[PDB]
Amino acid sequence: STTLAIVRLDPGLPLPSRAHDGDAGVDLYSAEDVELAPGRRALVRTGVAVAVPFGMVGLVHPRSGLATRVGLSIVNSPGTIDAGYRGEIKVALINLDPAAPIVVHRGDRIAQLLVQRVELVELVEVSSFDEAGL
Amino acid sequence: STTLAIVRLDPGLPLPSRAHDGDAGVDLYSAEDVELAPGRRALVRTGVAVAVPFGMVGLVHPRSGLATRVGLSIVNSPGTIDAGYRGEIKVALINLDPAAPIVVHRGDRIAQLLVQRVELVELVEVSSFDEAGL
Amino acid sequence: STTLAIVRLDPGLPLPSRAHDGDAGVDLYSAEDVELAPGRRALVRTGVAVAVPFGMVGLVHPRSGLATRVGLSIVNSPGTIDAGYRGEIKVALINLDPAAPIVVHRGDRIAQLLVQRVELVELVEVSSFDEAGL
């Protein structure tokens, strides 16, 4: 029900979509062709920008299946997209396989985007946890 | 209070359990014996299947403590278990240590499973973020 | 609005803070000087302890930007801080770059802490998912 406004910065890519109604995330595609040699990383453009609602957070997870099979991961997983970030979502892909290079083609699914509420907690410093109402 | 129906596909393993009432996750065990050489990964069976409620998501995190001490991690962390996935939870374990192999014994805790609500957002494409009601 | 009681175990470090009102996390600093050689990891002290509310969970994510640029990651990401954990938050940093060492200085931002609600689900074992009220 909650709406996620999304802009296809690169109109040549398919609009991300939820494969199944209950799926936690939507796959993001790569806007560029990139080849990751064993152990190497790259900041890859997804060609999309989103407006995560205040009080929520966008999270970029690596995909399972073949992606995991070949050792594709994300350096800063879970990628954190803040409510105020309106820029292009980029994925810090990293090939965790010791010998087999990973070839990323433009249009390839490289990650999945989830949206969850986040507790924008107010940090209150205390000398110790022996505080009433902790 | 929310219920998580779980099936022990492998009855020989202990039923996952929450060590402490407030703990975010429950440890999942390995149904198989596997030895991860430095830098190598493996898709390991947990011997369990769960029914994550619609509107929620199951998340598989690496464990802290000794697991972290030896460099055990998860390729696609956080492992994403969708509300519709009723299959066996498998963990893409990876030994991130450069020289010390990691031996996983059947019955060993290999990860922890958390359950959180997820915002099944409806993506609405827009030409730009200069939209009323964004 | 939700309060997060925090103790600066090391008073010499800045109190973690939310850079922007809607930011999902607050940066945690390193209380120690540490140099991570390529592929090596270390359990680094943040000099802070927090009281995550019951029903919630603290999550430690790697930071984006330069941190990702140099290949700094977290072995057990997302770091899971349970509601009952009142000890010092430590970050299992790992240099995922193959050749460039990462130098962590005392006072350097090494990760970000988020707080989210977590479903403290009650696991109910079932022989199969063909259960009424699943």
Curated annotation (Swiss-Prot), chains A, B, C:
Single GO BP term: dUTP catabolic process
UniProt-recorded name of the protein: Deoxyuridine 5'-triphosphate nucleotidohydrolase
Summary of subunit composition and partner proteins: Homotrimer.
Keywords assigned: Hydrolase, Magnesium, Metal-binding, Nucleotide metabolism
Cofactor(s) needed by this chain: Mg(2+)
Role noted for this protein: This enzyme is involved in nucleotide metabolism: it produces dUMP, the immediate precursor of thymidine nucleotides and it decreases the intracellular concentration of dUTP so that uracil cannot be incorporated into DNA.
Reactions accelerated catalytically: dUTP + H2O = dUMP + diphosphate + H(+)
PANTHER family: DEOXYURIDINE 5'-TRIPHOSPHATE NUCLEOTIDOHYDROLASE
InterPro entries (UniProt xref): dUTPase, dUTPase-like, dUTPase-like_sf, dUTPase_trimeric
Binding annotation for substrate: 63-65, 76, 80-82, 90
